[PDB]
Amino acid sequence: AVEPFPRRPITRPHASIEVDTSGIGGSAGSSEKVFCLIGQAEGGEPNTVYELRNYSQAKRLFRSGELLDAIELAWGSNPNYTAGRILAMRIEDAKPASAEIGGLKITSKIYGNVANNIQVGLEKNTLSDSLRLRVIFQDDRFNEVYDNIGNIFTIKYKGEEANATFSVEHDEETQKASRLVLKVGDQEVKSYDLTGGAYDYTNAIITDINQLPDFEAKLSPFGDKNLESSKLDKIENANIKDKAVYVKAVFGDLEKQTAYNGIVSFEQLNSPIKTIEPFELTKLKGGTNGEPPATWADKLDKFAHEGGYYIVPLSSKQSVHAEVASFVKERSDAGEPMRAIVGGGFNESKEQLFGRQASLSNPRVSLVANSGTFVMDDGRKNHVPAYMVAVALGGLASGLEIGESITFKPLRVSSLDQIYESIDLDELNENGIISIEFVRNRTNTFFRIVDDVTTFNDKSDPVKAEMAVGEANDFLVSELKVQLEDQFIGTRTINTSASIIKDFIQSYLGRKKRDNEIQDFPAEDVQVIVEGNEARISMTVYPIRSFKKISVSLVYKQQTLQA
Amino acid sequence: AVEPFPRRPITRPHASIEVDTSGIGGSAGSSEKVFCLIGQAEGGEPNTVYELRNYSQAKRLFRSGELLDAIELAWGSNPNYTAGRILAMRIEATWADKLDKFAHEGGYYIVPLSSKQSVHAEVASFVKERSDAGEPMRAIVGGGFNESKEQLFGRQASLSNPRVSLVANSGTFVMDDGRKNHVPAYMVAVALGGLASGLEIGESITFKPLRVSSLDQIYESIDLDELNENGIISIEFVRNRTNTFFRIVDDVTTFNDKSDPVKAEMAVGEANDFLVSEDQFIGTRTINTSASIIKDFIQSYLGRKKRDNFPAEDVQVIVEGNEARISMTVYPIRSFKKISVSLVYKQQTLQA
Amino acid sequence: AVEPFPRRPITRPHASIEVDTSGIGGSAGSSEKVFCLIGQAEGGEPNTVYELRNYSQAKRLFRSGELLDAIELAWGSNPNYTAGRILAMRIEDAEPPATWADKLDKFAHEGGYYIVPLSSKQSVHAEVASFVKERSDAGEPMRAIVGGGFNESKEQLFGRQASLSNPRVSLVANSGTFVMDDGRKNHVPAYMVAVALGGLASGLEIGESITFKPLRVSSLDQIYESIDLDELNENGIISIEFVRNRTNTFFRIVDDVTTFNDKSDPVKAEMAVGEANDFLVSELKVQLEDQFIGTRTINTSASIIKDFIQSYLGRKKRDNEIQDFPAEDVQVIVEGNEARISMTVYPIRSFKKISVSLVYKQQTLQA
Amino acid sequence: ESITFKPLRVSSLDQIYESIDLDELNENGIISIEFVRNRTNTFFRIVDDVTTFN
């Protein structure tokens, strides 16, 4: 916008400035082909989608389940490309482990049966007049102790009068601290309202009370403790004259110090409220996975408006493949383009692959034929069903640039269960099924992805037959819609508007040409007509295409040499 | 209308502004061809017409029933076309009293989810009662799971009506849950009604594909001709290619007549239902006239106009009772059903 | 097609994209000839059609039988040309079959053009003749190649060519000895030579003749004299000539004359131009049908159909499947239900006569 | 100058209307606020400046 300085106008004689920032704002680059996986694993909150950037982060969320192996293959397969973000979700529902003891709810922050190995125990430190809390968990070699818990600050009375007592008033409605009262003799000397105003934090009371001559106050010796004064614990007539009485909050100190604890969260039982008391160490119970869900449809819905383009479900079940096919379809039609890549079981006959391809013909799904073995970063050599190979292909396709085909690219696989003859790869390709070719004619022998054909049979339209072209189309039309929306909708039809839109379109297509996301655009074909409430825009685009045939015609000719 | 500003009139000295807005009014275009369904469902409140806009909303209102499978087919046969609005009603016997509720819901094609011929006759009567009013409609219907040609002919003859079409074939659709759902032919009629609703105004379903997995019966060319000539729609299994697919043979209507396209062929009937139709000089300017000089005058006029911008053989004039009716012929857009190629082999002398 | 983005419409203020793919969508190339064989064999299930691509695949699906030799000759006899697909079917009753008409029908909607039956019986020849006629009339053009037994006189050959005078059958006179990749030399009936000729004809480009193409055989049992070959050529029987005057001796296929008795029309007499006609009509039919039927008769359709036909015929000219065409004879008339289309084609003919006129003349050299 | 597609600044909305819901209200001439979600940045648009007139 043009910005007025000052913002508030003036009607004296004055000067004013009007600054235009529109020349320097820039715009967003090409969208990330974020890659989506949905998988079983231990650990992590169910039905929650996690953005992931490092394998370390993944292995902290997910604990060695098949989802983590899939993430491993997804990043690790082709290291010469920049790593993308991953969106991961845990299929099964899983209860956290819990216990009830000592006036408290104890709850795990992890979910699943592992959480039943958590155990916690609470004891009196009779030296510091405090609690001491033990937390121990074996699967991570985790052990932490929190001590001097409960003491927050102290008051000493140093007047010459014999009688001086500390007291905190209940609020029976809420069980909060209503007021702080200091008594000397038969009267209050000073008192504070704790659940509102200037004294709603303990540190401010400590600051004020130290001004009074007879009283002095200090924080706990250990740590650094401050609380909303509402959480002060109920204390009556405590004889601050004889010794410096420690003021306490027990649950508040537990909450505050455990705030950064990643293993256990605590809540208090109720109204009457139970006194916090030490207890012999107890295990958590009842943490378990449920049965695997019969439908994934309502969970795949969670990826909606998570801005990621390729999905692989970690299952071989045709029902799951039809589910994800439908989800891809509905998100595409709603204007959030998607694709899915799919694979069979461990080793399934060529008839079964045609069966799947016929039962699931859709230009936004791809089926991977081969199954094989990978070598893991753990050093295992493991045997994996073909959908894990589809995970590897998805990681590659999300690593390649927009419209850069996975056709005829190396696959970092150790071996394949089926190695197909030339004619079998011909037939699988003709049926629109992706296969992996073992290249034996070279001295170095390696595995190539044969082609990026989609499961939609009709080769006639490249936007349907080929993944790369459909992807380039989807991103083209999506970035057109979103940018024309945010740039022009609601703007006034100024007499120049058609020229401005033409310049904007030519700028956009210039960028797409620069980045090798289109072959070219004939800029003379960009035409804009503005008529009343709308603009109609027309443009010609030559799409970018991978080579898939080369024909060489080689003609021998004689030559006469003389000297 | 022209708006006065101020709205109040004034007589003391003043200015007033009259605003002609009429140069800007719009939205005068057609309705879309909203699609209509009636049939069995769970969950929905019976005999209430619901607008539906996506399958999620359908599964939210209706559940666990053949109406939701119908809505699925209604958006699944035409994936490369706009998924428009659908109107649907759970019906919990006479059906007219229910069909009355659609009377002022602006939808053009209806399908009853039933094979019962009484239902089809009721629906044809409803379509008649609406279309003779200001709001045209059509219906599509189908048989059961397998009916003979003579049964189909008997049904078509009993249901012979220029706004009803019968579909013969039945088959299997792959649903989005992956179920191989075997369905009676009236669900194929739902699929065709969905396609016809998706197509443009006066496009035609002939030679469009049907995304169906298999058909219960495959008709050879003579049987396809028999059904077509009887005004029954049939589906061809295209076998002449490795890329086999299923093709809608024609958009014929159960009223078959060679003498009028508009009643024989559904798409031209729809065009007539949606087409749009588009200067005076008075005899006091002349002492006497006749149809001959009226014709020659209007020919000179339209000759001047077409020079600035009509064949004398194509304008008719009748004068009666101080009134002259001038009737032009006009040519609407049809769709090809026949291509005739005459191939002549010549031969040529080359020389060098 | 043209498609909206999004697919579901929006009412509130928005932008929407409409995208057209016709300019990049491909088109069907020139159709492929595929060769069909029906044979006595051991091996896979009878009365089903196998597509075969490799001799190894064939030698797994079939073994040790005349069908496998026929497949071998079909690929081996045309070394210069790309080895096409073969459609092969073992036949046995579920013992010798009385009739093959019950089984030939299983080829009907396969993508196959040339048939050879591996038998000498005239009844089988009539059956395949009827089948090829049936499928052609149905709109799936085919041809049959036919041959006799081990050794036959001209009388018997003329009798057979009487029994079948037909524009879609060709009779092969000669029988001979081949040499096989198994290191074997075997005398074979003339229909195995017909298998070789069908392999070559299906390998050759569309509209290219087998006349004067070489044939590869160890020997022929009947070496016909020049008058004998002229006699058989007049009777529309294909004969193999032993070239002897050249230093190199080899076997020519003399001519591609069909068994049809009237030579006045070459489209009926000669296999090559009949095949070119069949493919031209088939491709015109199927492409115009899927292109235009059901489309709106918009005012410009008279342009668009002419442009389509001119493009198609330009493509046919490019592949040398027609000689030429006049562009201005491509004419289209539109009436409310019907497109009426006119075209002229100059078809492509093989040279079968060359006449040289040589005029000796004097020149006066002087210096 | 129209308020359509101008931003609006609010901590939250109690009713988040779906796309079909917003189309319904826009057809009825009721102004509605759209929660933009597909962008990385999430913000509230004023959908349209339609008056209540039918």
TrEMBL record, chain D:
Name of the protein in its database record: Major tail sheath protein
